[PDB]
Amino acid sequence: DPQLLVRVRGGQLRGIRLKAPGGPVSAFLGIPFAEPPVGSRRFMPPEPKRPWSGVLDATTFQNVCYQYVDTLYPGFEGTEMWNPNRELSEDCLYLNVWTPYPRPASPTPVLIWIYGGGFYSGAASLDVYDGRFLAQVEGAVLVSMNYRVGTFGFLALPGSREAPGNVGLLDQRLALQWVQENIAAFGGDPMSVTLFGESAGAASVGMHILSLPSRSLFHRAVLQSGTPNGPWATVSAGEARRRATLLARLVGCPPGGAGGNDTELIACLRTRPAQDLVDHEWHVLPQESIFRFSFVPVVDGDFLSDTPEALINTGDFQDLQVLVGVVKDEGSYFLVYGVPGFSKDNESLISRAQFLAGVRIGVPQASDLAAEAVVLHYTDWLHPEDPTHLRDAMSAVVGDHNVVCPVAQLAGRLAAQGARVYAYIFEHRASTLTWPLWMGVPHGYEIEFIFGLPLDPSLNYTTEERIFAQRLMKYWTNFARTGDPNDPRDSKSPQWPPYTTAAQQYVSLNLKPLEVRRGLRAQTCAFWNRFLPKLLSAT
Amino acid sequence: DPQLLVRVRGGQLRGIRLKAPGGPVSAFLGIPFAEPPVGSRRFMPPEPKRPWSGVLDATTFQNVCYQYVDTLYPGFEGTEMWNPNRELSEDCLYLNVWTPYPRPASPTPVLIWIYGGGFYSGAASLDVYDGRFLAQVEGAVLVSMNYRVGTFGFLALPGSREAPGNVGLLDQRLALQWVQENIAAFGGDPMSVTLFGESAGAASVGMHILSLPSRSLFHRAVLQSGTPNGPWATVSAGEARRRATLLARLVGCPPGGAGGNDTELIACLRTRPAQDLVDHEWHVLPQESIFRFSFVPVVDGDFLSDTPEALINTGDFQDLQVLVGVVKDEGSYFLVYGVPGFSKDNESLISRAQFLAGVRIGVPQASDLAAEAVVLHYTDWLHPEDPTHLRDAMSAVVGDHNVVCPVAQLAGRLAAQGARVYAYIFEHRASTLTWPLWMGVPHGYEIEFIFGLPLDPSLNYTTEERIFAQRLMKYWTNFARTGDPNDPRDSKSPQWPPYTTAAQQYVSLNLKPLEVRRGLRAQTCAFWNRFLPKLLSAT
């Protein structure tokens, strides 16, 4: 079947024909995009996959990059669903392609997805990132690649030749240059590349916009629940180094009282079993905390010429179309992972003292005064001990601090600089959600919908959820083709207005039709984005 | 008429028979309570009036103490009504008495009123402090004295024998000891003395509670729109001195490059025409500001053993009944006096920059960071330039900072220490009010009502206002006799609950019946009373 047989710039491939509810889909899973970054390649910028003979099989999902695996709640769908579903391996630089069966007629727009997992975990192989529905139904050419997370992706000794950092991003950039020079053959338009990701994938998409060289490889961008500018998606060189060598040292690299040879250091590191590194991953953070990750993009003054803050602050984004948004309760999920009093198993009605402590875990960089400021802001002084309030407060400190305000800081900075921005607030809690009611709509629970999982009848969502999904898919693909999530020409009732400095408009993405709103946590985010920082830089 | 003829501990007096709408009233205006504090007596603690021969005439209002007179809006009722209505003079230590005609049967409870005017102005002679209605109607024995304001009342060189400070308070204490030993003769009960005042009079009442010796002279207390503990009702010794000598120096005291003789300094000051002092009164403040006064009670470690803060913080008020309250917009009035953009003549829709400046005038002690904090708190980040919002914000910064939060800090501190406290929010704007609508219910516009001015038909309020007034008078006199503003035994519908740490209950004093509420600006006041201070003590 020529539908499943495609010649790529480096060789032939054989896809597989998948069956989505509305029909058939072509799927080319496992395409090498680079030479496995193993052995003496570990910590190195990726290299273009060499051309192969014969017909490369591409009927299946490849190995997940090497990464920590979540224990915490073993056998629990809520956590497991995020875990690797393929074998772990340093040989994981592959991407996927879904195209409607049969290949489109003309150059369809492409949706390149970037998975997220703190920069330390994640995989395109995942169920919720099943690009079949968006290709099947909205007739889109969808691509999802794997990029090195953890030490392998980001361990860096800034200035070094052999562990220079951000290589997990270069992985994604490489997948992008491949989509450029080969998506054509799948019926995709190399001229309408729309990047889109969640958590650190969103953060990533952000970095592509902030990085010159990534510019020519995409035209539109979506950033769900995450940005390049907050407190957790980048570290300085100094800290990077501090965590590289510290990690090395715990692994015996270098052995003895040796030193001053970054090369020997990396050479040594390059011999340790992958799992040895993952084993010490979490011991290099400088404080007890949540929503903070050990190995993530570093401000090298290369891939990022300066901090994302400085960049979105003075960049020229005068033409960029960008969709951005957030969910009802970003912070909830993270509380179970480390804030005394919280669990998925009870209502986590915490004490005040617990909440006071939470604030220091959740805002680890905060001095005392700054912590005080945060407590002032989130305490309800008519009921400073209501456990239920405290509980939700904790979730807000975390969610606002890491996701919401940073989103809003980016939305506004973008708009003010030229961007056409759109914003939203996912508020629908999936019926199927396995987390406790108290977490409401946790970080990452919009994905099922954007990808169109409710369209699968076996999966069993509600018809509303299904319709909902379709609506969501429609907005995305529409922003994808046009650069406006809006019903074509067809001005079908509710409209989605561009987020603007002055009006500050965003929409409620939920079961009830679009419902425009103004100001994304405006006060709260003024707290965080405007004042808090000066407090911190004083203390 | 023996009704109008009374023998006092120091001589005979002849009252005059006044006619209130509901009947006749005995009125003994002008009773010397002390030896005129003139000449070598200036700046000195008051002395008990010597006994006189014959029949002291007391049919009229005496001279207002020496004080600045408000220009600003000449001929304008709103300001004029506060101005002296008698001749100015250092010889002004007299008090007044109103008793129902004819003298009560049995020992009626007494309401001693303390006028307020920044500690720099004011007089019992004023129209709104007409005690005839409260005596006539509620059959109360009412007393209102004059106390030295300004330099004469408070100029102090702490530690000095001749200008030791707080003498304006000693004036009031002296009036109190007189009520003690003579109110009896007017049918008043020396056993049910209820002090009650507004602005600095409230602040004063506060100081009596905080001062041991004032204790035995009163049993209940009311504090309207003012407390002893805020930012403006007390100064330290050091500042007192700094403003005494600076004032002296501007007046040529001492002349030349002389010095180190406080006595010579005061001696010299004692020769300057009263108006020479008033002339430089306003030049000793340390910063540009509003709701800040030059000469006011000083923390000498005598009349006040320590700051009012420390005192209400550790005092034993376990038995004290205290009514406390505030008006809708305390801060409004003060804005016209010095905050660029405000006037009584336009809507004062200020700019943002104006508001930013306002904040520094209105919170003169604030460092930059602290100012930032205040701006953060009062800015509406969805509309940071809406003039109308800015406008009202300014009024709130001032009103909350100086009156409301301090009231709330006192209410709570009192309650927590044993006091039985009651609280309220006057929200009715008199129909007659001559200030612009934008000031809503300005500092001091409850007085007309408590005193019962609407009962006078000529004055022409509304019947509701009249009824309202009666209600208000009822609460006061009731708190006065019982120590509970509540309808006797007669549980007549809405009840007024004690303000409590835990429930934080207060009531809406307005046209519609009592309406209990919880938390007096709880967040906002947490800002001011809890956090702001630590910010300031850091900066």
Side-chain angles (χ1 to χ4, degrees), chain A residues 1-486 488 494-539, chain B residues 1-486 488 494-539:
Chain A
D1 181 3
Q3 287 304 303
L4 317 204
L5 226 308
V6 184
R7 150 80 94 309
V8 149
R9 199 154 166 295
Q12 282 213 274
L13 301 163
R14 135 149 64 279
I16 155 154
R17 201 201 81 152
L18 272 48
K19 268 164 271 314
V25 212
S26 270
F28 296 71
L29 279 39
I31 312 153
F33 63 90
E35 284 294 78
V38 304
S40 60
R41 265 7 267 304
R42 191 183 260 170
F43 313 129
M44 285 306 238
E47 256 165 10
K49 194 344 158 236
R50 268 148 67 251
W52 57 101
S53 97
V55 151
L56 187 8
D57 167 301
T59 85
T60 193
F61 266 148
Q62 271 295 284
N63 300 310
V64 159
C65 290
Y66 215 79
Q67 65 169 253
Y68 166 106
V69 162
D70 200 271
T71 353
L72 183 54
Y73 293 125
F76 171 63
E77 189 205 87
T79 37
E80 297 300 351
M81 67 173 289
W82 297 120
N83 263 335
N85 60 349
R86 267 353 170 231
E87 272 199 38
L88 284 173
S89 143
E90 295 197 62
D91 186 11
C92 60
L93 296 197
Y94 303 135
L95 60 79
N96 310 294
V97 175
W98 305 238
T99 288
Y101 188 65
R103 275 212 268 307
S106 167
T108 289
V110 289
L111 251 36
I112 277 158
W113 161 264
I114 305 188
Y115 65 73
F119 280 121
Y120 77 82
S121 83
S125 333
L126 289 190
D127 281 9
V128 307
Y129 317 149
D130 192 343
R132 107 245 245 84
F133 315 98
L134 291 133
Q136 195 281 293
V137 170
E138 303 288 327
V141 177
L142 195 154
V143 180
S144 78
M145 87 291 246
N146 278 2
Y147 57 112
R148 288 179 278 175
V149 290
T151 17
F152 320 98
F154 302 94
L155 184 151
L157 265 82
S160 91
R161 217 204 77 244
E162 30 260 330
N166 297 321
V167 304
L169 287 184
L170 293 203
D171 289 358
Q172 321 161 315
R173 150 189 295 178
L174 206 233
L176 256 32
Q177 322 174 249
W178 177 105
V179 94
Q180 215 49 6
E181 52 176 53
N182 281 280
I183 194 53
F186 296 77
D189 190 3
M191 268 349 177
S192 121
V193 162
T194 273
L195 304 174
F196 84 121
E198 200 259 15
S199 203
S204 293
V205 167
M207 278 174 264
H208 288 130
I209 289 169
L210 261 348
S211 203
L212 260 18
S214 294
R215 292 302 288 195
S216 19
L217 340 178
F218 69 108
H219 313 92
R220 273 175 299 295
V222 182
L223 294 83
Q224 322 176 199
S225 283
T227 60
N229 63 286
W232 59 264
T234 57
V235 303
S236 49
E239 249 284 284
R241 174 153 189 65
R242 184 228 127 221
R243 324 137 162 218
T245 74
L246 161 61
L247 181 107
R249 218 180 279 127
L250 292 178
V251 108
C253 285
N261 200 300
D262 297 333
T263 326
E264 301 189 34
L265 204 181
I266 329 267
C268 179
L269 262 162
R270 230 175 330 249
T271 90
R272 314 259 168 260
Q275 181 67 28
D276 274 29
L277 282 346
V278 171
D279 276 327
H280 283 289
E281 224 190 324
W282 301 114
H283 301 171
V284 294
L285 285 180
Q287 307 97 186
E288 183 194 353
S289 51
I290 37 165
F291 220 130
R292 213 99 341 178
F293 314 106
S294 313
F295 293 96
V296 296
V298 57
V299 169
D300 35 20
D302 183 74
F303 191 110
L304 309 172
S305 18
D306 202 317
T307 343
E309 212 77 24
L311 295 190
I312 61 159
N313 142 234
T314 70
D316 187 303
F317 314 107
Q318 196 212 328
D319 69 286
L320 220 189
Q321 274 109 83
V322 174
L323 188 193
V324 173
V326 139
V327 284
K328 221 200 36 265
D329 330 58
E330 310 285 10
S332 37
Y333 178 86
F334 303 79
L335 302 177
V336 298
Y337 286 80
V339 179
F342 298 82
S343 128
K344 81 172 208 86
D345 296 322
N346 50 19
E347 288 209 273
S348 342
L349 277 354
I350 72 151
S351 110
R352 218 198 139 64
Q354 288 179 322
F355 170 95
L356 277 341
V359 168
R360 328 281 333 247
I361 280 168
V363 193
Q365 71 272 51
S367 77
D368 296 301
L369 202 42
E372 225 110 66
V374 185
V375 181
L376 192 219
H377 194 93
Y378 291 81
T379 294
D380 161 26
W381 306 98
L382 212 250
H383 307 100
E385 335 255 332
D386 164 46
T388 292
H389 184 88
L390 284 168
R391 186 235 273 150
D392 303 345
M394 230 339 105
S395 162
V397 177
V398 180
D400 300 338
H401 177 42
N402 293 296
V403 193
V404 193
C405 307
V407 166
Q409 167 72 356
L410 178 77
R413 255 299 147 79
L414 242 25
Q417 239 89 193
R420 153 185 246 58
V421 177
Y422 288 69
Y424 70 75
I425 295 299
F426 191 97
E427 311 178 302
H428 171 51
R429 162 179 236 263
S431 59
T432 63
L433 209 311
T434 30
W435 292 98
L437 215 297
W438 82 248
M439 313 181 92
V441 156
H443 184 71
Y445 294 85
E446 76 260 40
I447 345 250
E448 337 191 348
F449 304 91
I450 311 286
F451 275 90
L453 272 59
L455 289 91
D456 179 345
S458 77
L459 275 173
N460 76 102
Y461 288 79
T462 76
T463 332
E464 308 93 79
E465 303 196 276
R466 175 196 310 154
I467 303 156
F468 185 13
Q470 316 191 215
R471 205 175 106 221
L472 285 144
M473 328 192 39
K474 256 305 292 359
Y475 296 117
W476 262 258
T477 38
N478 256 326
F479 167 78
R481 40 225 170 206
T482 82
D484 184 332
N486 279 296
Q495 225 67 177
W496 176 335
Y499 174 101
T500 25
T501 1
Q504 298 193 23
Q505 318 204 245
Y506 75 81
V507 290
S508 143
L509 259 291
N510 121 85
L511 288 207
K512 276 43 263 166
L514 265 199
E515 185 205 295
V516 190
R517 297 166 200 187
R518 323 188 43 222
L520 235 194
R521 297 255 216 314
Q523 263 76 17
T524 299
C525 297
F527 172 47
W528 293 106
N529 319 333
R530 303 216 166 43
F531 177 53
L532 225 230
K534 14 256 303 227
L535 236 192
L536 288 175
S537 43
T539 58
Chain B
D1 182 3
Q3 287 304 303
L4 317 204
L5 226 308
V6 184
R7 150 80 94 309
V8 149
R9 199 154 166 295
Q12 282 213 274
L13 301 163
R14 135 149 64 280
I16 155 154
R17 201 201 81 152
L18 272 48
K19 269 164 271 314
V25 212
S26 271
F28 296 71
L29 279 39
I31 312 153
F33 63 90
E35 284 294 78
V38 304
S40 60
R41 265 7 267 304
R42 191 183 260 170
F43 313 129
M44 285 306 238
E47 256 165 10
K49 194 344 158 236
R50 269 149 67 251
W52 57 100
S53 97
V55 151
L56 187 8
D57 167 300
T59 84
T60 193
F61 266 148
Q62 271 295 284
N63 300 310
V64 159
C65 290
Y66 215 79
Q67 65 169 253
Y68 166 106
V69 162
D70 200 271
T71 353
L72 183 54
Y73 293 125
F76 171 63
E77 189 205 87
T79 37
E80 297 300 351
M81 67 173 289
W82 297 120
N83 263 335
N85 60 349
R86 266 354 170 231
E87 272 199 38
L88 284 173
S89 143
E90 295 197 63
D91 186 11
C92 60
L93 296 197
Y94 303 135
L95 60 79
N96 310 294
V97 175
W98 305 238
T99 288
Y101 188 66
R103 275 212 268 307
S106 167
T108 289
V110 289
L111 251 36
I112 277 158
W113 161 264
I114 305 188
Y115 65 72
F119 280 121
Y120 77 82
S121 83
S125 333
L126 289 190
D127 281 9
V128 307
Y129 317 149
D130 192 343
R132 107 245 245 84
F133 315 98
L134 291 133
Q136 195 281 293
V137 170
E138 303 288 327
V141 177
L142 195 154
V143 180
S144 78
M145 87 291 246
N146 278 2
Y147 57 112
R148 288 179 278 175
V149 290
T151 17
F152 320 98
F154 302 94
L155 184 151
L157 265 82
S160 91
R161 217 204 77 244
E162 30 260 330
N166 297 320
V167 304
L169 287 184
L170 293 203
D171 289 358
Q172 321 161 315
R173 150 189 295 178
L174 206 233
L176 256 32
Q177 322 174 249
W178 177 105
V179 94
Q180 215 49 6
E181 52 176 53
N182 281 280
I183 194 53
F186 296 77
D189 190 3
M191 268 349 177
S192 121
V193 162
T194 273
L195 304 174
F196 84 121
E198 200 259 15
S199 203
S204 293
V205 167
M207 278 174 264
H208 288 130
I209 289 169
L210 260 348
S211 203
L212 260 18
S214 294
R215 292 302 288 195
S216 19
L217 340 178
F218 69 108
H219 313 92
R220 273 175 300 295
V222 182
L223 294 82
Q224 322 176 199
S225 283
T227 60
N229 64 286
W232 59 264
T234 57
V235 303
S236 49
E239 249 284 284
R241 174 153 189 65
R242 184 228 127 221
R243 324 137 162 218
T245 74
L246 161 61
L247 181 107
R249 218 180 279 127
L250 292 177
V251 108
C253 285
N261 200 300
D262 297 333
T263 326
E264 301 189 34
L265 204 181
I266 329 267
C268 179
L269 262 162
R270 231 175 330 249
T271 90
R272 314 259 168 260
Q275 181 67 28
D276 274 29
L277 282 346
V278 171
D279 276 327
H280 283 290
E281 224 190 324
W282 301 114
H283 301 171
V284 294
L285 285 180
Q287 307 98 186
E288 183 195 353
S289 51
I290 36 165
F291 220 130
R292 213 99 341 179
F293 314 106
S294 313
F295 293 96
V296 296
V298 57
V299 169
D300 35 20
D302 183 75
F303 191 110
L304 308 172
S305 18
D306 202 317
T307 343
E309 212 77 24
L311 295 191
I312 61 159
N313 142 233
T314 70
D316 187 303
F317 314 107
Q318 196 211 328
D319 69 286
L320 220 189
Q321 274 109 83
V322 174
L323 188 193
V324 173
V326 139
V327 284
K328 221 200 36 265
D329 330 57
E330 310 285 10
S332 37
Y333 178 86
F334 303 79
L335 302 177
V336 298
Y337 286 80
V339 179
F342 298 82
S343 128
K344 81 172 208 86
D345 296 322
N346 50 19
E347 288 209 273
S348 342
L349 277 354
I350 72 151
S351 110
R352 218 198 139 64
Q354 288 178 322
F355 170 95
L356 277 341
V359 168
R360 328 281 333 247
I361 280 168
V363 193
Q365 71 272 51
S367 77
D368 296 301
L369 202 42
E372 225 110 66
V374 185
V375 181
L376 192 218
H377 194 93
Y378 291 81
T379 294
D380 161 26
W381 306 98
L382 212 250
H383 307 100
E385 334 255 332
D386 164 46
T388 293
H389 184 88
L390 284 168
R391 186 235 273 150
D392 303 344
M394 230 339 105
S395 162
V397 177
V398 180
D400 300 338
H401 177 42
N402 293 295
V403 193
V404 193
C405 307
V407 166
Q409 167 72 356
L410 178 77
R413 255 299 147 79
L414 242 25
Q417 239 89 193
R420 153 185 246 58
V421 177
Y422 288 69
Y424 70 75
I425 295 299
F426 191 97
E427 311 178 302
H428 171 51
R429 163 179 235 263
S431 59
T432 63
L433 209 311
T434 30
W435 292 98
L437 215 297
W438 82 248
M439 313 181 92
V441 156
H443 184 70
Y445 294 85
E446 76 260 40
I447 345 250
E448 337 192 348
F449 304 91
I450 311 286
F451 275 90
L453 272 59
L455 289 91
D456 179 345
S458 77
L459 275 173
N460 76 102
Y461 288 79
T462 77
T463 332
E464 308 92 79
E465 303 196 276
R466 175 196 310 154
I467 303 156
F468 185 13
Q470 316 191 215
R471 205 175 106 221
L472 285 144
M473 328 192 40
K474 256 305 292 359
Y475 296 117
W476 262 258
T477 38
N478 256 326
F479 167 78
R481 40 225 170 206
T482 82
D484 184 332
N486 279 296
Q495 225 67 177
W496 176 335
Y499 174 101
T500 25
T501 1
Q504 298 193 23
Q505 318 204 245
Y506 75 81
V507 290
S508 143
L509 259 291
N510 121 85
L511 288 207
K512 276 43 263 166
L514 265 199
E515 185 205 295
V516 190
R517 297 166 200 186
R518 323 188 43 222
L520 235 194
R521 297 255 216 314
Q523 263 75 17
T524 299
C525 297
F527 172 47
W528 293 106
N529 319 333
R530 303 216 166 43
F531 177 53
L532 225 230
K534 14 256 303 227
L535 236 192
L536 288 175
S537 43
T539 58

